[PDB]
Amino acid sequence: RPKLRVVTLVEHPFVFTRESDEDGQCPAGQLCLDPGTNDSARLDALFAALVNGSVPRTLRRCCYGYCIDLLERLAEDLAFDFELYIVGDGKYGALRDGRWTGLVGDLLAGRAHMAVTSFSINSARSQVVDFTSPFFSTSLGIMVRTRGTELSGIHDPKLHHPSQGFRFGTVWESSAEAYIKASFPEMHAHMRRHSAPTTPHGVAMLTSDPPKLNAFIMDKSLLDYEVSIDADCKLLTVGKPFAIEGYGIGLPQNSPLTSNLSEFISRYKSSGFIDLLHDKWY
Numbered sequence: 001r002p003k004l005r006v007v008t009l010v011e012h013p014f015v016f017t018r019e020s021d022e023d024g025q026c027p028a029g030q031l032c033l034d035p036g037t038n039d040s041a042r043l044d045a046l047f048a049a050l051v052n053g054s055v056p057r058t059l060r061r062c063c064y065g066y067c068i069d070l071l072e073r074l075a076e077d078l079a080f081d082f083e084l085y086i087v088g089d090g091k092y093g094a095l096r097d098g099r100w101t102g103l104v105g106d107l108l109a110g111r112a113h114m115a116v117t118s119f120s121i122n123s124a125r126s127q128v129v130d131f132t133s134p135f136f137s138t139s140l141g142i143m144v145r146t147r148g149t150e151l152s153g154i155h156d157p158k159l160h161h162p163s164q165g166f167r168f169g170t171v172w173e174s175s176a177e178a179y180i181k182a183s184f185p186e187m188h189a190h191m192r193r194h195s196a197p198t199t200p201h202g203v204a205m206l207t208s209d210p211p212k213l214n215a216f217i218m219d220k221s222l223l224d225y226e227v228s229i230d231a232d233c234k235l236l237t238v239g240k241p242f243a244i245e246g247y248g249i250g251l252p253q254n255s256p257l258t259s260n261l262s263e264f265i266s267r268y269k270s271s272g273f274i275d276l277l278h279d280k281w282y
Contacts, residue, residue: 003081007112013225013281014118017061026062033085066281071116091173107252115250120175133262134246141220141237149214153239168215169194179243
């Protein structure tokens, strides 16, 4: 069985992690490394150290979730083994200073055979890496606190001509930020001073004392999950859907794995297995 190196990004409910056991193993979930690096040699050395060195528990996690259940099914059906690490910079990927960051950057650099998480397909990314047929689809959405800001959607004048002290943001180096940069460049100029490194950081800005955002824009799939777990039910999503994109497994261009993964993904969709994962994890 070929052994594939898979990069991921922790984003609920697609990928969660818990601590490893006393021996740094995972009785539940799959062992994931948390290297914090995009240094190829360091990453190679860390995986090697699993077999002939000593990787401490501070760098081990056990991942689980919708995408991990999907990866396990694929490994079975396609007969491969895998090893996982969490992308060092915690980002999905953008082109910055001439290089791609995040998951996209690690695929291009040859640091992983595939990227598996809530990873959006867009035209810019598809030009440099390949994606399987999509396993999930989502609009972008807008999250606000209840009993406050009301918005019609991405065209609301509150977003195009913001009032004094009104603040909104997205997640750095996400596909949401890329869509806004391309479609609403003047809006992006406001947001980019008010955005967050991860989805949870952006949701926390809505809830801080005092709040640092009045609205937060991100994949509606992800925002819906955060609404569902808020302890006070004080978050909600507002406005019309926009910027629909598929989630896919990312691979370097011309990978011999892509077609075979797509064929299984299509079968999981039609058979109900993809819907089962949604019901399990939401």
